[model samples]
Target: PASEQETLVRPKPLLLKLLKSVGQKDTYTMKEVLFYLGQYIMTKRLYDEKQQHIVYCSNDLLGDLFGVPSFSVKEHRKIYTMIYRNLVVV
Candidate 1:
């Protein structure tokens, strides 16, 4: 017989609950999606070394609710590029 296993709390349920608590929006654009995700990661303290992986997790978490597939690495890179370009100013 195997030892009893302890189940860890899943991030999805907490993440979904947080997402549901937000105000209603007419539409969820990519910018809005990323905004919510940024807020989630910050509030949850779920940041990672790479950061891009966090973005993937966020996309996957909201995929079903938004009826959109997870973002590709290229798309995430592009999004970060745009973000950096605006903030870097160099």
Candidate 2:
């Protein structure tokens, strides 16, 4: 769990880059985007309901809302959606 926090902290700048790229329709793998969004959701203690609502409806909206980043994960890839389910309570 501690290690998760460690990993999450290093990526904001990367995330910022990813977010910017999304607007330009720049290519990026699904895993890369999911990883960052998952990290953000877990680190920020953002509620699942809010996250689901945002992601399911519109990810670009989140990008615009946050300004720094915006993206979405596939609904079928529940693992990303489930990242905060246990709060990484190892």
Candidate 3:
């Protein structure tokens, strides 16, 4: 599957805009996009204040990104969420 990393993928409008906030361009590999976004998530500090481990998607594009109102991750395990299919196939 390492070869698939070469494929240039496109993100939907919401994700595209999110990526833009982090200085990403139009095209990206699925893995590449997720990696950048994982960093974006960390930098954004979207995790919940009470639990710290659970990050609730309250507003912005977090809820839409995970397609849920809330999400949980173990530290860097946030990258474990495989929502890469959210990207456009083009």
The best candidate in terms of TM-score: 3
Candidate 3: misplaced stretches above 4 Å? 1-7, 49-52, 74-82
Q: Estimated TM-score per prediction? A: 0.34, 0.30, 0.67
| Model 1 CA lDDT for position 65 | 36
Candidate 1 clashing pairs, residues 3+ apart or interchain? none
Question: Could you tell me the C-alpha RMSD of candidate 3 in Å?
Answer: 3.6
In candidate 1, where is summed lDDT lowest over 10 consecutive residues? 1-10
> Better model by TM-score, 1 or 2?
1
RMSD of each: 16.6, 11.8, 3.6
Report lDDT (Cα) of residue 2, candidate 3.
Answer: 67
lDDT of 1 by residue, 8-44 (tens): 2222343445555652433343444456656755565
Off by over 4 Å in 1: 1-18, 48-90
TM-score of 3: 0.67
Tens-digit lDDT string for candidate 3 (1-90): 466556677887877877888765677876677677767677888777777777667675867776776666753344334455467655
RMSD of 2: 11.8
Off by over 4 Å in 2: 1-26, 48-90
- The Cα error of candidate 3 at residue 27, in Å, is 1.5
